[PDB]
Ligand binder design. Structure first.
Ligand SMILES: O=C(Nc1cc(Br)c(O)c(Br)c1)c1cc(Cl)ccc1Cl
Ligand SMILES: O=C(Nc1cc(Br)c(O)c(Br)c1)c1cc(Cl)ccc1Cl
Lengths: 114, 114, 115, 115
């Protein structure tokens, strides 16, 4: 039910081999590790979770943009990019979190479908 | 070699049934019709052209954003969104033109891969 | 009543010396030159027009992104960024057209205010 | 040396009355409150800090987008938008953090200048 896709606005390409960590907000308001992986050749990260595991709650998707840029020899501004949202069962069932990266900027959107 | 994908930043969804027209710049500097279609349920428009037809040159992708918004009952700012670029055989071979729409704003990127 | 601002997402800076051409759709359906200028050191282009001159119409703001990137020695994807909109059709408004540039991407937004 | 500007991509306007909280990473690795404020009618938030106070460090600028959209009666996707960056590590700089909001999307950029 959750896919992350990352694109590079400088090169006009997927952002490949970018680390992504997903956390779930715990009862005590801390961020608990939930899923992680690295984007593929298409800039996509599939298979993070299952429907059974992905219960309603607040999630954070942290994208390691800084390591991405440094690997390409580029000095970036941000430490990482964070996307924090609530999963709601009343809405559609599949979530794509997309991010478009530049050294000093990023954009993100949600594509939420059934 | 050419795909167009359109997303809606207000609803968090693909932008479905959006008209898209592609033109090629002619020798006389006019814009000649090249391909067209409507985005699918995934927000994607496939099958616009073939490798044989998609020669180097300047192309314009016009996205009918105004009709899209009006169909949803929303007053938009722009008449359309235009994306104008050069296809270059020295670069990778497959082009995805992606656009993210809001009533008063849009973003576009190119994903160019082999 | 019309201002254009351009920022550079690679440098984290204003986009300086960006050429901008504004056209207005004529009776015969052609794009008539209306005004032009260059962004300043702040990334802003002021003084394009006047409230008398900026009548109702369909306007095109062409931001010469290719020229900008090439002048920096970069080979970018797009020829330019065009922003096309109807203006002043419910009386005079002030318009800021903002753009944020990367070599293979751009975004644009409008800020529309009623004086 | 720190300014936050927020625009609304739905309305085509500044995003007014947006709450912003700035944190600085402490020695123990926690996010310490540093400053906070609200955007004005221009969408701008000035006066967060001073050059004395804005020392080197890792800063987080939290823009309370959910609160903004809810106050407008809209149900948005994100909780907030966070912008996290190292500041002043090669001496004092001025930073503008700009954001452009839609209910299911946002973008952010930095303008960094050396006075
Ligand atoms: O639609 C966007 N990216 C995108 C999102 C998905 Br889902 C895709 O399958 C592809 Br191809 C591209 C996008 C576009 C801009 Cl102009 C800014 C931000 C995003 Cl995330
Ligand atoms: O708010 C934006 N730019 C901007 C627009 C204006 Br008008 C300014 O005075 C400043 Br300072 C910045 C913007 C931000 C993103 Cl993240 C994407 C596109 C734009 Cl035009």
């Amino acid at each position: 039910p959750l896919m992350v896709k990352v694109l590079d606005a400088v090169r006009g390409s997927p952002a490949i081999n970018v680390a992504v960590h997903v956390f779930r907000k715990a009862a005590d308001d801390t961020w608990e590790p939930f899923a992680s992986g690295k984007t593929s050749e298409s800039g996509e990260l599939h298979g993070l979770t299952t429907e059974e595991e992905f219960v309603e709650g607040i999630y954070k998707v942290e994208i390691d943009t800084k390591s991405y840029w440094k690997a390409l020899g580029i000095s970036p501004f941000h430490e990482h990019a964070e996307v924090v949202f609530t999963a709601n069962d009343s809405g559609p069932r599949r979530y794509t979190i997309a991010a478009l990266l530049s050294p000093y900027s990023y954009s993100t959107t949600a594509v939420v479908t059934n």
